[PDB]
mmCIF file of C-alpha atoms in Angstrom:
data_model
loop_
_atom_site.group_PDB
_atom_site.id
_atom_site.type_symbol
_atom_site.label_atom_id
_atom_site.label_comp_id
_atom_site.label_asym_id
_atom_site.label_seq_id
_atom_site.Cartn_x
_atom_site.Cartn_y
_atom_site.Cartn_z
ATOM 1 C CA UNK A 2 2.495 74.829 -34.132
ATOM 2 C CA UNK A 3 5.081 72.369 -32.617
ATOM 3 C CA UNK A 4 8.763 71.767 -34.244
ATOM 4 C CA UNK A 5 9.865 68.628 -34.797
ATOM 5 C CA UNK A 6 11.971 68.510 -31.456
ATOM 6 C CA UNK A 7 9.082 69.545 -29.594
ATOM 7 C CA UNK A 8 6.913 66.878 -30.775
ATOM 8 C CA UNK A 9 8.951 64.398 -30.358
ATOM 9 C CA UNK A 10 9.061 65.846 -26.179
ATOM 10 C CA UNK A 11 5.487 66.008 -26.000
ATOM 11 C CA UNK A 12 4.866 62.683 -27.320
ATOM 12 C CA UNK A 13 8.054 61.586 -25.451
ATOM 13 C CA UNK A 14 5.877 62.766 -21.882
ATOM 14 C CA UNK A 15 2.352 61.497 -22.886
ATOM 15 C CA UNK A 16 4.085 58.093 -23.617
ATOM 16 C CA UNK A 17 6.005 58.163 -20.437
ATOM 17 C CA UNK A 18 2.348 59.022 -18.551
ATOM 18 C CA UNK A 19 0.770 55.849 -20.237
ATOM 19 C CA UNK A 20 3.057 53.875 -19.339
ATOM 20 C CA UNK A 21 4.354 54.958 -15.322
ATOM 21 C CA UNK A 22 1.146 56.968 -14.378
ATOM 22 C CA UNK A 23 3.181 59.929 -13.406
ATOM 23 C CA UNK A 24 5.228 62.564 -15.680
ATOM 24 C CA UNK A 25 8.510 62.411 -16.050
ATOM 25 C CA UNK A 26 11.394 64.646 -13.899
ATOM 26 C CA UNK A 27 13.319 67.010 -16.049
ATOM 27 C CA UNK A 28 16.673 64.415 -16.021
ATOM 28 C CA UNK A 29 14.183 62.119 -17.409
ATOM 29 C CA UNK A 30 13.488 63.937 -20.338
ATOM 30 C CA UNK A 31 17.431 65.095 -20.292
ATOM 31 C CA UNK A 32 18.264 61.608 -20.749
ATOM 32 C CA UNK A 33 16.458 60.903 -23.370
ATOM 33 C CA UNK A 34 16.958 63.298 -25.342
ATOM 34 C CA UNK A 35 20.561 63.175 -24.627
ATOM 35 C CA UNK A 36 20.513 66.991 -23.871
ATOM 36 C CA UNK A 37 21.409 69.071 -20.501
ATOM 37 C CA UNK A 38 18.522 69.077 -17.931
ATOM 38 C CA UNK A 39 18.483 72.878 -18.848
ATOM 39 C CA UNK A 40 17.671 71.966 -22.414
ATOM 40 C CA UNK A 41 15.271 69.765 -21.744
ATOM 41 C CA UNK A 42 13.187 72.600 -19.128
ATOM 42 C CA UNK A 43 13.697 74.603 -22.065
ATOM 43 C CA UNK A 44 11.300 72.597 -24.482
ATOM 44 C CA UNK A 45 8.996 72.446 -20.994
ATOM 45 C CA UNK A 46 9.134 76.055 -20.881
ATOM 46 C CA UNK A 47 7.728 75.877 -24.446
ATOM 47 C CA UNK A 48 5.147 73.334 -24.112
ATOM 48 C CA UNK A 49 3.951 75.255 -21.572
ATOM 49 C CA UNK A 50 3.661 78.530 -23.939
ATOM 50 C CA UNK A 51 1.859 77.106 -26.696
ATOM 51 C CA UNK A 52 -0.861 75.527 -24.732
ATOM 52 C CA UNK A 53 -0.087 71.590 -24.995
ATOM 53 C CA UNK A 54 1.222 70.958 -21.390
ATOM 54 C CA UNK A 55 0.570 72.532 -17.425
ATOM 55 C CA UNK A 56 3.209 72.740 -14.987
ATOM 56 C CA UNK A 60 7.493 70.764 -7.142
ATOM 57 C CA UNK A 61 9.121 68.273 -10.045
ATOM 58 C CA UNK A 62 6.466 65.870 -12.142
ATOM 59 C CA UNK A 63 3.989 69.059 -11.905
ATOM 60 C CA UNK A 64 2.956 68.194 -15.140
ATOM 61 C CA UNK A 65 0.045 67.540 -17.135
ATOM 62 C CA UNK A 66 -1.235 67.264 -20.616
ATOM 63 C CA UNK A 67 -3.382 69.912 -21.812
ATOM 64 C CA UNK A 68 -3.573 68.978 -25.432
ATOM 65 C CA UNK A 69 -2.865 65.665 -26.413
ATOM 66 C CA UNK A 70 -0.950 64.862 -29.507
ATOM 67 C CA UNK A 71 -0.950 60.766 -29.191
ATOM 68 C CA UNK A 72 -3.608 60.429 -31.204
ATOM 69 C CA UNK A 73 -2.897 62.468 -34.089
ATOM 70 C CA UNK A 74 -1.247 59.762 -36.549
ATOM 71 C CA UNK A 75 0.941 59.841 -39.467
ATOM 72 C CA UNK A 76 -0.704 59.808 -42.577
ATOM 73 C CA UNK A 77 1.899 58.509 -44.788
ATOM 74 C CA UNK A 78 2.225 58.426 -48.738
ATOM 75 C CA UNK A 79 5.149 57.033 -50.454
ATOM 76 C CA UNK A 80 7.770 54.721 -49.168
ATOM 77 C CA UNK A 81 10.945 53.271 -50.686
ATOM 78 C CA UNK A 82 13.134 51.167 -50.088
ATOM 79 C CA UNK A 83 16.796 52.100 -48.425
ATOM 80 C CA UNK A 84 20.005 51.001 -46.836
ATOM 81 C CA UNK A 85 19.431 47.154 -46.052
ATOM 82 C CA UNK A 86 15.944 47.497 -46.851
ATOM 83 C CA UNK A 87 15.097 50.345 -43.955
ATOM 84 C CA UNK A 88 11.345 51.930 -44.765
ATOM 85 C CA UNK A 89 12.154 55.273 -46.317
ATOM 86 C CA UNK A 90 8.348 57.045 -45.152
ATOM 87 C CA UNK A 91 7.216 59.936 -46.696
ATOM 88 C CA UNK A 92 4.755 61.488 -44.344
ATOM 89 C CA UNK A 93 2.216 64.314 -45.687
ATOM 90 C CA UNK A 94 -0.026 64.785 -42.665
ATOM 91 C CA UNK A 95 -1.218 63.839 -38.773
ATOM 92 C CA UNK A 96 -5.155 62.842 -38.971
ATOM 93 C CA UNK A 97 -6.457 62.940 -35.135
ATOM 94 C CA UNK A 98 -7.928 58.957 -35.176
ATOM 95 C CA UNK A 99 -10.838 58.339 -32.468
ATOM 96 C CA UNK A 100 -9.207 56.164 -29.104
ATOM 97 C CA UNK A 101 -11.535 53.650 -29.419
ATOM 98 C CA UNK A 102 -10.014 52.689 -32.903
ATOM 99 C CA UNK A 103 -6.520 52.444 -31.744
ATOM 100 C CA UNK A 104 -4.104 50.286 -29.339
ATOM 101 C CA UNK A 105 -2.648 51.137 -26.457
ATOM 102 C CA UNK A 106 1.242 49.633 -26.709
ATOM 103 C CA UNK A 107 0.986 50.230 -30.495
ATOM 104 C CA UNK A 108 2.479 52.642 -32.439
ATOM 105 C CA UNK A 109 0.154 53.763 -35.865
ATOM 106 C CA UNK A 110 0.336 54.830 -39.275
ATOM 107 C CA UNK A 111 -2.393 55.335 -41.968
ATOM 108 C CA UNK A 112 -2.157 54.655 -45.437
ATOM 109 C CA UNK A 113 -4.555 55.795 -48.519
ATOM 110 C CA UNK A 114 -6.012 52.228 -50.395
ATOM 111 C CA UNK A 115 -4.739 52.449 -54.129
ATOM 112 C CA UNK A 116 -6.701 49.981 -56.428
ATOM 113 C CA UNK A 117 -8.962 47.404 -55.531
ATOM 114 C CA UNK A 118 -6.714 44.839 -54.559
ATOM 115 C CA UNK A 119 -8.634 44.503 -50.795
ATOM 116 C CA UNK A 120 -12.347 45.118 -52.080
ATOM 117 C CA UNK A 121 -13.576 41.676 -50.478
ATOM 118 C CA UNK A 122 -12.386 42.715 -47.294
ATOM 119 C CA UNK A 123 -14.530 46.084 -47.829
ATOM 120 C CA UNK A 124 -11.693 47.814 -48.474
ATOM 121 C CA UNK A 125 -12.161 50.456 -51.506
ATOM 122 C CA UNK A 126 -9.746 52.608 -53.359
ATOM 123 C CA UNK A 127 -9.496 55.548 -51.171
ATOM 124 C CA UNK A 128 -10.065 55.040 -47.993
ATOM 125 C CA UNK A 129 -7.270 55.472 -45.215
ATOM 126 C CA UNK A 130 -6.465 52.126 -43.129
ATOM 127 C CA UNK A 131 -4.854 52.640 -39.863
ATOM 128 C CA UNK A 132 -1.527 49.938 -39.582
ATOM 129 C CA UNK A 133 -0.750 49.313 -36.334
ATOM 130 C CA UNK A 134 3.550 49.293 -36.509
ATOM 131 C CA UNK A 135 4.783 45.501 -36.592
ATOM 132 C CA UNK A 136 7.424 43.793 -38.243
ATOM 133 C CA UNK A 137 5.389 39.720 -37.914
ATOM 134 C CA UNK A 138 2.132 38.804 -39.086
ATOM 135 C CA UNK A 139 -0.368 35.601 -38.392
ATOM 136 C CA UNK A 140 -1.622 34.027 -41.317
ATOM 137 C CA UNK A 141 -4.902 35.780 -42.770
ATOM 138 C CA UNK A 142 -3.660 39.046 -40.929
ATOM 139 C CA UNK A 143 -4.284 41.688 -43.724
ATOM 140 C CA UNK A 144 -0.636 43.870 -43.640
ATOM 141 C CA UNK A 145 1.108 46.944 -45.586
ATOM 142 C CA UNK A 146 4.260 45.133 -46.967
ATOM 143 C CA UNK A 147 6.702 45.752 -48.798
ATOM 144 C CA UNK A 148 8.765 44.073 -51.685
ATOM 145 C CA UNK A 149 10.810 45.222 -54.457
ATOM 146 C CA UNK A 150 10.223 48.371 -53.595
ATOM 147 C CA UNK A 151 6.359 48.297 -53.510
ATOM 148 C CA UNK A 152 3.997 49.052 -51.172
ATOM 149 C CA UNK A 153 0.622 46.372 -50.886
ATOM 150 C CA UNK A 154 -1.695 45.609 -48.701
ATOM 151 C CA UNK A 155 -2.636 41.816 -48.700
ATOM 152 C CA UNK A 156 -3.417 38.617 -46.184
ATOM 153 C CA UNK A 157 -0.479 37.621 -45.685
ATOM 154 C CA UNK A 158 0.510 33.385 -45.726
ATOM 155 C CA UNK A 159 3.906 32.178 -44.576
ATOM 156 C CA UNK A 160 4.288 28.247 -45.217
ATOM 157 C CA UNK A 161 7.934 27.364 -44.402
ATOM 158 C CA UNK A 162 9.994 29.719 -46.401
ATOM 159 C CA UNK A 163 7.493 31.013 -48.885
ATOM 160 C CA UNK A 164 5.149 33.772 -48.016
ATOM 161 C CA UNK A 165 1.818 34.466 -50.108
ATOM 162 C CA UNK A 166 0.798 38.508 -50.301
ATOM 163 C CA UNK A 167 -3.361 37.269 -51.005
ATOM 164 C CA UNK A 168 -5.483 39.696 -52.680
ATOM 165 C CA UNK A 169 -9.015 40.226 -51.328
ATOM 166 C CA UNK A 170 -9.955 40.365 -55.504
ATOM 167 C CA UNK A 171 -10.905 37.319 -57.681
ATOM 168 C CA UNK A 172 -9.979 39.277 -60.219
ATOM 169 C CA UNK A 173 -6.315 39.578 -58.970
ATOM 170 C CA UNK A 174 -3.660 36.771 -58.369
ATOM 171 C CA UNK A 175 -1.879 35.910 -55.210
ATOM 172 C CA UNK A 176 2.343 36.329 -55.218
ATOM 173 C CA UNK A 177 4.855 34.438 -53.671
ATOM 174 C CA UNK A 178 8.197 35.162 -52.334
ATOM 175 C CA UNK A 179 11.159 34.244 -50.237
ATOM 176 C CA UNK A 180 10.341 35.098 -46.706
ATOM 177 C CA UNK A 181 12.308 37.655 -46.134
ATOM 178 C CA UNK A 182 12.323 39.386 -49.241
ATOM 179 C CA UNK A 183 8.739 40.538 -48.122
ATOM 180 C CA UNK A 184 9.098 43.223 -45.031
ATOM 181 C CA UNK A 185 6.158 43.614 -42.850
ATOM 182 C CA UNK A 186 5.468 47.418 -41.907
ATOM 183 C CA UNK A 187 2.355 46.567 -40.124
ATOM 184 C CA UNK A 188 -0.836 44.834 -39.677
ATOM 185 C CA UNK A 189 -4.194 46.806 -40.831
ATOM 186 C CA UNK A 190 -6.543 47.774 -37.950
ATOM 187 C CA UNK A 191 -8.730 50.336 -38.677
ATOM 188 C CA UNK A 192 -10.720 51.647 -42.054
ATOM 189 C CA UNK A 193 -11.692 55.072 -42.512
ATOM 190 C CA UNK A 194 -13.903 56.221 -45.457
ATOM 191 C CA UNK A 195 -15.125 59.615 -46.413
ATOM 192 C CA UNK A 196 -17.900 59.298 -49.301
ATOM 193 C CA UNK B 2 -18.935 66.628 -20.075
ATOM 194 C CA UNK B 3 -22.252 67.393 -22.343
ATOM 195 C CA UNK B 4 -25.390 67.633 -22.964
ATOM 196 C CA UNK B 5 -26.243 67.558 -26.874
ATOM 197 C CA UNK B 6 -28.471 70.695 -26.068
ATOM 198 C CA UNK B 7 -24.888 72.127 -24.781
ATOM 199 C CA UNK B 8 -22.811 70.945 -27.435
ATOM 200 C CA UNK B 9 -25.371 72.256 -29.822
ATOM 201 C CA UNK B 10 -24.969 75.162 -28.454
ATOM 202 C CA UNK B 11 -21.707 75.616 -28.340
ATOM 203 C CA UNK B 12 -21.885 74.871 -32.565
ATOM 204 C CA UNK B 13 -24.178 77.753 -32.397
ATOM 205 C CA UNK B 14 -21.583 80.044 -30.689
ATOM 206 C CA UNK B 15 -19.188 79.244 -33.055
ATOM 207 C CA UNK B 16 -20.849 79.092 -36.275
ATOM 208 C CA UNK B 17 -22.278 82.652 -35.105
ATOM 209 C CA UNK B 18 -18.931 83.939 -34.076
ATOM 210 C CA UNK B 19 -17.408 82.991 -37.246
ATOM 211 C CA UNK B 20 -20.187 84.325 -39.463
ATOM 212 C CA UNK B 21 -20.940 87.627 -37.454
ATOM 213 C CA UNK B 22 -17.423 88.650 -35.721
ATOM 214 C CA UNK B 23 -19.426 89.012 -32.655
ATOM 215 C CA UNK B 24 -20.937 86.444 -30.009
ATOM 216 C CA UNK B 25 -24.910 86.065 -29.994
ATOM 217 C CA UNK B 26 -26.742 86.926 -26.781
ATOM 218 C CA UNK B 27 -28.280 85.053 -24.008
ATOM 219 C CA UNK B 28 -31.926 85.379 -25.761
ATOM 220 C CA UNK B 29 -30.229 84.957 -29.360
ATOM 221 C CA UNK B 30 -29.120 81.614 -28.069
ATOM 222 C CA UNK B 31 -32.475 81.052 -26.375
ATOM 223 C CA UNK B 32 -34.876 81.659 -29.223
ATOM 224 C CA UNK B 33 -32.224 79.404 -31.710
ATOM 225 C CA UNK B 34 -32.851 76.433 -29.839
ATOM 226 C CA UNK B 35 -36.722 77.286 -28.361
ATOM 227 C CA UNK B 36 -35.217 77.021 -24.626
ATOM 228 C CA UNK B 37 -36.088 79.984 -21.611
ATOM 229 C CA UNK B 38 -33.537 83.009 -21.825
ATOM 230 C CA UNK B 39 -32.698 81.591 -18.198
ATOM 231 C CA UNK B 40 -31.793 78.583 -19.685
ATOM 232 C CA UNK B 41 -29.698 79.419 -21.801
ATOM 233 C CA UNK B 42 -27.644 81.523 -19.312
ATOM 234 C CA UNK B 43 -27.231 78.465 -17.392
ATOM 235 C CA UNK B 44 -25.657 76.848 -20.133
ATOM 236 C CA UNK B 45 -22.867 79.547 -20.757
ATOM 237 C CA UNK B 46 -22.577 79.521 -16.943
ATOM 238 C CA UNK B 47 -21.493 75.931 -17.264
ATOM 239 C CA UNK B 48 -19.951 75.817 -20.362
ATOM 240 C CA UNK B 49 -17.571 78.304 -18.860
ATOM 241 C CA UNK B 50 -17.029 76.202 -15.714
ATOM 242 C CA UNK B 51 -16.218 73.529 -17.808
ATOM 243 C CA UNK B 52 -13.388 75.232 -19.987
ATOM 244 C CA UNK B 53 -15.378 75.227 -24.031
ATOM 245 C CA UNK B 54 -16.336 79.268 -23.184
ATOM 246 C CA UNK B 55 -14.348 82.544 -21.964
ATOM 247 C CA UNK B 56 -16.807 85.323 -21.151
ATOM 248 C CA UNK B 57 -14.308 88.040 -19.652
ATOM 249 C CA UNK B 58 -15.765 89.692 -16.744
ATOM 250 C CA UNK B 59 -19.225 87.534 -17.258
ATOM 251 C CA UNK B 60 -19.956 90.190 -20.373
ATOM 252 C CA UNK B 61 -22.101 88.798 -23.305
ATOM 253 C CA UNK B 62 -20.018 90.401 -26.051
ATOM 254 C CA UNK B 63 -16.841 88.859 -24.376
ATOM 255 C CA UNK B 64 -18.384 85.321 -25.275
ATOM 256 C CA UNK B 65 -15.880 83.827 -26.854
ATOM 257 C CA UNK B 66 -14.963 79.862 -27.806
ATOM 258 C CA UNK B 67 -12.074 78.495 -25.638
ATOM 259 C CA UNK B 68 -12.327 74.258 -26.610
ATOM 260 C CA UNK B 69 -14.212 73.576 -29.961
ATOM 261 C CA UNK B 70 -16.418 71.120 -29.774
ATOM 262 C CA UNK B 71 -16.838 70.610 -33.751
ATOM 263 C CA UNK B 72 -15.126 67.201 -33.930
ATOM 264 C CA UNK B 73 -17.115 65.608 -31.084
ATOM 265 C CA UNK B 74 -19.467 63.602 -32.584
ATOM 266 C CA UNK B 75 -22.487 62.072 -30.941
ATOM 267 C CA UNK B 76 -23.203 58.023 -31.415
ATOM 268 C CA UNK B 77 -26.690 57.939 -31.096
ATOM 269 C CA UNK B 78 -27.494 54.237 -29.405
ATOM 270 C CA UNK B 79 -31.197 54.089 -30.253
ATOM 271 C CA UNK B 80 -33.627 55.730 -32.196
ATOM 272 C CA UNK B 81 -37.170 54.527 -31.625
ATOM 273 C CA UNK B 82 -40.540 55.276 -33.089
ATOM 274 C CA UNK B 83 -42.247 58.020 -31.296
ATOM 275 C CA UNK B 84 -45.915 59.498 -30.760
ATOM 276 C CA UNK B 85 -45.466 62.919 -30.733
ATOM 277 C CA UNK B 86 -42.342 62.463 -32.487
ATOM 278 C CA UNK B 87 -41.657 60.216 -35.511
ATOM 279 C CA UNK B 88 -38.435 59.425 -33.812
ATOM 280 C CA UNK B 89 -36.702 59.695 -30.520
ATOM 281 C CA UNK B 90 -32.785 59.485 -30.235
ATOM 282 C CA UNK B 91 -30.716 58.213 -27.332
ATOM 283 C CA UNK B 92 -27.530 59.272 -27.000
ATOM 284 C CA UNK B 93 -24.793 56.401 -26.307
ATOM 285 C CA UNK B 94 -21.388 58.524 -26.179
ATOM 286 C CA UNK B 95 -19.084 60.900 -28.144
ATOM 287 C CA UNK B 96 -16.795 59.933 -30.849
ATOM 288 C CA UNK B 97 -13.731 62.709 -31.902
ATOM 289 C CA UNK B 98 -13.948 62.465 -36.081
ATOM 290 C CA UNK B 99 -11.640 64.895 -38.020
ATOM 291 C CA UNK B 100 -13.377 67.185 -39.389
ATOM 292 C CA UNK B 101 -12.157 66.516 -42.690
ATOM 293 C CA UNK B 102 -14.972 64.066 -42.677
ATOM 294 C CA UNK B 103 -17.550 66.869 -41.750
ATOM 295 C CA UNK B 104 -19.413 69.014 -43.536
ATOM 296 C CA UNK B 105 -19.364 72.571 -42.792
ATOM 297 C CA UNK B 106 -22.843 73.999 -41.895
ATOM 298 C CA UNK B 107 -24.134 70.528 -40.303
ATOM 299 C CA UNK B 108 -24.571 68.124 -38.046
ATOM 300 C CA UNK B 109 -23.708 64.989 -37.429
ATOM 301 C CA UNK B 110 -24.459 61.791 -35.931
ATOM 302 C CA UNK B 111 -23.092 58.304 -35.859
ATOM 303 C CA UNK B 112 -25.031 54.721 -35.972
ATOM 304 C CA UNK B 113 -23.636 51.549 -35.445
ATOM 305 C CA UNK B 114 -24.274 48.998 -38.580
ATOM 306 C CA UNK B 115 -26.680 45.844 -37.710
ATOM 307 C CA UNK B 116 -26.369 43.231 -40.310
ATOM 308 C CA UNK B 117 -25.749 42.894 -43.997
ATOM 309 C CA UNK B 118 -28.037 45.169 -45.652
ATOM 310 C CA UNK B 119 -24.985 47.491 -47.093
ATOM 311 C CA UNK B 120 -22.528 45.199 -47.632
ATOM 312 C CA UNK B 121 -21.991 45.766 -51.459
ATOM 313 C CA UNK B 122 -21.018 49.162 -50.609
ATOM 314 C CA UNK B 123 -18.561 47.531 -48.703
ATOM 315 C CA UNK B 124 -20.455 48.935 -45.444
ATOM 316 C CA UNK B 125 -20.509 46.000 -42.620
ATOM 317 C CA UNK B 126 -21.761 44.843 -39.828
ATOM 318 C CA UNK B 127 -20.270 46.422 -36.972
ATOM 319 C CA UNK B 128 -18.924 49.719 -38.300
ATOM 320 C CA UNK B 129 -19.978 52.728 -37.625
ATOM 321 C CA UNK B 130 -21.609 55.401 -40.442
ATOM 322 C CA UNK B 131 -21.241 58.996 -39.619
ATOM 323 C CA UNK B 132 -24.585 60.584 -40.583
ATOM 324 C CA UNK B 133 -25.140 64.028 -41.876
ATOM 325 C CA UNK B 134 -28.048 65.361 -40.374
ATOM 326 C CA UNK B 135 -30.320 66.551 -43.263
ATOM 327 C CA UNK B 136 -34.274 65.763 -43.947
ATOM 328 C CA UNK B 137 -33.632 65.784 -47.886
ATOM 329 C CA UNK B 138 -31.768 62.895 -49.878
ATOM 330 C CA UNK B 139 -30.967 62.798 -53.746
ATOM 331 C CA UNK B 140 -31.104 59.587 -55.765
ATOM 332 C CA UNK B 141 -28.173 57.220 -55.056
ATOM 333 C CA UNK B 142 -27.489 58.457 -51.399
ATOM 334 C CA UNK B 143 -27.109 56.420 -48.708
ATOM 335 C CA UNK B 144 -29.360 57.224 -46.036
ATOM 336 C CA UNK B 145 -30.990 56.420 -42.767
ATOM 337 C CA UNK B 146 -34.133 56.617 -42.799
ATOM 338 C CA UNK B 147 -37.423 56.399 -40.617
ATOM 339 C CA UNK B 148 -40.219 54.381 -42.324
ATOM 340 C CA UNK B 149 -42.956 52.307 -40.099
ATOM 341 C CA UNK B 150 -41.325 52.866 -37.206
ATOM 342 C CA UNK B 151 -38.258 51.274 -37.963
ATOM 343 C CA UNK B 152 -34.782 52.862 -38.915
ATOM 344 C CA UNK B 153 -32.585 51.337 -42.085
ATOM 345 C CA UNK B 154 -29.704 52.078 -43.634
ATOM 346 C CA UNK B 155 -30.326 52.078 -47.653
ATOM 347 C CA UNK B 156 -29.629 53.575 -51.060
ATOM 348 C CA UNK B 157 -32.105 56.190 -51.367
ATOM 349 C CA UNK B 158 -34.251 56.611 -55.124
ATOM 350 C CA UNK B 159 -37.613 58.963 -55.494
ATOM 351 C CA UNK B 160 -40.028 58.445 -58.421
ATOM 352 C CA UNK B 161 -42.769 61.124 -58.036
ATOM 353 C CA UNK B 162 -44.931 59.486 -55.114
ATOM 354 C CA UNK B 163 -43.009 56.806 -54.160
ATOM 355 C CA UNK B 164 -39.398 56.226 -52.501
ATOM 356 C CA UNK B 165 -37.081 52.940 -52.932
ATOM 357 C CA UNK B 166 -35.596 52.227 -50.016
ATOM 358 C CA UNK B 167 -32.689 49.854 -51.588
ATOM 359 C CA UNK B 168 -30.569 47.425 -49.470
ATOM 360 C CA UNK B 169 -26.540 47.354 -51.256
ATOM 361 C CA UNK B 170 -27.402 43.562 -50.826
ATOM 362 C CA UNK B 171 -28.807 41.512 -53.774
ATOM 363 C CA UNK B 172 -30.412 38.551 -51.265
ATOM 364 C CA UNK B 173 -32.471 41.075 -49.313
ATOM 365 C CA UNK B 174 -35.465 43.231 -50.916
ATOM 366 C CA UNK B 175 -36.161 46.485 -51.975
ATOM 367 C CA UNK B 176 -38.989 48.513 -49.923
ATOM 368 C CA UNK B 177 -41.207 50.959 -51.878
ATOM 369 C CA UNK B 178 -43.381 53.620 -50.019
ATOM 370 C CA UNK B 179 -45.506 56.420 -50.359
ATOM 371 C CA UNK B 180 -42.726 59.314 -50.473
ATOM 372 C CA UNK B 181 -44.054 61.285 -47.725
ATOM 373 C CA UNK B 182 -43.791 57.896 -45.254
ATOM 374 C CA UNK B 183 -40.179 58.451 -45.341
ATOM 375 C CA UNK B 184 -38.633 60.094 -42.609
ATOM 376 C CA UNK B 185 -34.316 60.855 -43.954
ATOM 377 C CA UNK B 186 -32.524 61.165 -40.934
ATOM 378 C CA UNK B 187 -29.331 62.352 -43.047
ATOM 379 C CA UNK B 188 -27.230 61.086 -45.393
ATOM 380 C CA UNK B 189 -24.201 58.296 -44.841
ATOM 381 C CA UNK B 190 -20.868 60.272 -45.039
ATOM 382 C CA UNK B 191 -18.421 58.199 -43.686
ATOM 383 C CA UNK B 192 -17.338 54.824 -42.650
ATOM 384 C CA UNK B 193 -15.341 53.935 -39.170
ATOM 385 C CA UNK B 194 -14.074 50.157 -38.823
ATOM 386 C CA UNK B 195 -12.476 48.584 -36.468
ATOM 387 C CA UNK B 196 -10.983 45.202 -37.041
#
């Protein structure tokens, strides 16, 4: 079981592999962490112990992978100037294929029927991709006055449209930036 | 990488394992999966190479798992109507599914969706259904199934002698057979999509 800290090095040196095709030095992972190099050989040291990484300098490679493993978050609020407060209740290990490279992810449980004529059902788990624009008829999480939907989303000049996928349901309209984007939708992922 | 007759048996090792608190032999594996006793020793002698077994000083009661395979699940590219067999299965690659999505004590495939046929259980074209492997369905499952030679993806009902075979898609028609025609490759558990 990782701590937080040593999660956040992990993903810190799988992300630094993806994108520079080497591992980073030890003053690499001092800097950003804004510890001493010491500290940082110390989470190594750790890694190394519990089985998630293999170690001259840049000896280093990943022995169990926690990129994939995404946050499965639940509720989210509103806070200072509007920043997503996340509530996160689990990692779900998503299948490569499925997911971005340059991306980060989240996943989301469907409440309602609001997206059921995009085949998306109360339940299931879509995989957001992290970005703060949207194209119109890109289905996104959103959120505005303090409320979490997913939708297509519609900008004409300063209005944007949250569109149900439900003929049942109505479309709502807002001031631009009253509506923050968390992230475009994906992936879908149903257990029956 | 795998064989499905070595990731098989590596399910076997651990189901065993788990059940049994010891590992089963060479012939134990052998006779499970109707392969020689050589063979099987083969297997472990790879398996080992490759890093999913430990067998400490090559001993058979040291067999232990070192890499679970139990979320690597096979997509199966083809299955085709056989003569020997009602159905032959070509494998296409491995897919990693949390096992959250699996059930314990089984199998599991995935197929990728052709066409409309499920789309009012929201199932489309283009995403992939994990498959339970089971020869049984109840009414209301969604299945894949074997009939004529061909494989479909339906909602599965049994009246006495004769099985519906009915598309989640108003525009396309039901297929009613003699019950024992129909071949259930397992039942539809889960739904990947990509967008």
């Amino acid at each position: 079981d990782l701590t937080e800290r040593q999660r956040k090095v992990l993903l810190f040196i799988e992300e630094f592999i993806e994108k520079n095709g080497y591992p980073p030095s030890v003053r690499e992972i001092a800097r950003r962490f804004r510890i001493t190099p010491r500290g940082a050989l110390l989470h190594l040291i750790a890694l190394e112990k519990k089985g998630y990484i293999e170690r001259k300098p840049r000896a280093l490679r990943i022995s169990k992978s926690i990129r994939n493993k995404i946050p499965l978050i639940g509720e989210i609020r509103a806070g200072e100037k509007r920043e997503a407060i996340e509530y996160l209740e689990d990692y779900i290990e998503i299948p490569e294929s499925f997911l971005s490279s340059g991306y980060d992810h989240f996943l989301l449980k469907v409440k309602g029927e609001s997206m059921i004529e995009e085949h998306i059902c109360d339940g299931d788990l879509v995989l957001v991709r992290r970005q703060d624009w949207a194209q119109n008829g890109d289905i996104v999480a959103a959120m505005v006055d303090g409320e979490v939907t997913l939708a297509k989303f519609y900008q004409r000049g300063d209005t944007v449209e949250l569109r149900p996928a439900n003929r049942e349901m109505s479309s709502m309209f807002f001031r631009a930036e009253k509506v923050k984007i968390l992230g475009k939708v994906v992936g879908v992922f149903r257990k029956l």
